[PDB]
DNA sequence: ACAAGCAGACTGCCGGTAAC
DNA sequence: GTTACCGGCAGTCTGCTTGTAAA
């Protein structure tokens, strides 16, 4: 089929940019470099594409999409059994999730700064963040956690969150960080809970 | 007249005038060109005092990292503080008032991380910031307010939900609102973290 | 217009100025934008026909060139040779009328081993001037008019000598005795080395 | 004194350019480069030397004279017995030393072109260009070489033996191109010599 | 004799538009 | 789909000019 290609080159363009983009940079790798990885041709990309920035937008939603599937894996099989022992399981999760460096680049660096702090958010209020938002929402339901307002404590703790993984990803000795860091993040949960 | 006095006005000139422009509209979309113009120096005399955008760019941080301090310190001493737990109080309100500072946003919420490297910033924040909360933290342990745990990781962990707390409260659709409620979840957060 | 024509009218215009330029002054000496200003192109459609600078010198070369061996051939047809003899040194009476020209020798005789080395240039000139040379030397062989020898080394010495025969003439303060006197040696040498 | 230490740093930029403008070429050497492998600044270096032309021309000027000296000692140590076979002697000779990578790169390519065809020349006649000159006067002055303008036939002559070293140097099969280019150099000679 | 500040210029490259 | 093309940029060079010495 004549449109059922365009998602095959789309695809193409998103992959080699998420590998590439993943290991350096946004800035860092150009179209030229992006394109032949691909596989096709700058003029096909800007074809699919408004700009660079549009094809970073795609990728963004692939990786953090991917984030969502891989952490609801580990936390459906952590088995918590009240809404606070389900958040812990999900901040052990994006321990685990977070050691992969491509998640690093695109979501915790590079997408701030492309798609703007609002732009991201709009994007991450699918994701994690809602999530998050969700996971809160129903800690307070079932009395687990005072209530309050829901939206800033969310983002707040996502900003605890993400900065746990950098610094345990760029620590020295990384096993200790990730222990360390694990510790303080429960320790400044249970401080929230009841 | 001398050089020593020469070379340190041109580069106060530049990094004056990228702390403007890069504040404004990001480092990503500011050129040297620009830059150089609104400072009154040629490209050359910049690409003397500095390496290349990025060394303009570190000294354009510490700068700014070391403003933040310095208004930080000043509300803090004004509010009476009077135990470690009344000093991080007061502080996460300081900052709260600073962040308000687009610029501050901009230069050091944003870009740094990219333009250094997450480990550069790192290590430039220890000598300001990041190295403040450190004893904080640390007095804060001492004076049996806080219970003893890992200083570092607390620390970034701590600036990181300071952070995006910041930009939550810039780009709310009501800002006042988010202030209140934004400080109200900090609140909650530090006093659960102390006694 | 077609995307092949369009593209070949941008890259004639652009080896038209930078042969006339660079034959003016050298390739050192003029920069690319000064090039595309006289191609009336922009630096930018430039880069998209040429690799480099470099790219754009050995296009240039390479045009020089065949100039060279069309000059060279429609001089050696008028003069009647018969012989491999009367060939070769019809050849060198060419090659001092078409040196005369000193775009031909700012851009083959003094830049080009530099630019695209010696080796570079060599591979280019195999095809044009040096391949006629080794070709006129081979029938020379093979009429018996001359001596059996590696044929690339001879070819190779007597176009150095040749070529800075002509440079001789062309920097020498009086040049109509210079061509007199070098068309001499040469000639002298020649004889010398038939029979 | 001031210039006993003057005189010093000029011999280091010349040593320093030398060695690499003679590996990669004047123009692919920067003044930078070359001051910090002199250990001088190059303020210094352009207090010393006119520009980058200058330095080269100082270090054209003491590569020719290091190529007649080498060049004498072979001529001598063969021993020749008349202006023909001193000939003969020194074109073998240049083919010993033009085996340098250094002096190829520094007199048979740049030079022309930096310091201009007839800059170089004014160099060359007070060394390899002139000497032949003198060899030309004194084999015809004997009768080996019958009578003619002698500046076209020395330039010539250099040229002839200038591109000789660049095949020998760039050949596939140097030992077999030396064997092949010293044949028909003495061939042209011979059949000079009447 | 040396050093530093500085200015004009240049090369290769990129991102996005528009003509194929 | 594709190829030509434009405005603009970052980092480097070269030589000039103003400052700071070791004689």
């Known amino acids: 089929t004549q449109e059922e290609r365009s998602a095959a080159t789309r695809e193409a363009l998103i992959t ?29 990309m800007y074809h699919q594409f408004a700009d660079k920035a549009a094809l970073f937008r795609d990728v963004v939603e692939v990786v953090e999409q991917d984030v969502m599937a891989r952490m609801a894996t580990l936390v459906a099989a952590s088995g918590a059994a009240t809404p606070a022992d389900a958040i812990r399981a999900a901040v052990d999760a994006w321990l685990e999730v ?7 680049q695109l979501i915790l660096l590079d997408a701030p700064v492309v798609l703007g702090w609002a732009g991201f958010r709009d994007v991450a209020q699918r994701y994690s963040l809602g999530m998050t938002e969700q996971l809160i929402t129903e800690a307070i339901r079932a009395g687990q956690l005072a209530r309050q307002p829901v939206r800033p404590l969310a ?6 969150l993400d900065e746990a993984a950098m610094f345990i990803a ?16 429960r320790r400044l949960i249970d401080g929230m809970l009841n």
Request: net charge positive; aromatic share 4%.
């Open 98 to 104: 977070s050691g992969d460096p491509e998640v690093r």
């Open 16 to 44: 080699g940019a998420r590998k590439l983009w993943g290991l350096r940079g946004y800035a860092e790798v150009g179209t030229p470099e992006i394109a032949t990885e691909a596989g096709v041709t700058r003029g096909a």
């Open 170 to 185: 760029t620590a020295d000795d990384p096993k200790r960080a990730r222990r360390e860091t694990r510790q303080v993040l």
């Open 155 to 160: 983002q707040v703790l996502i900003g605890a």
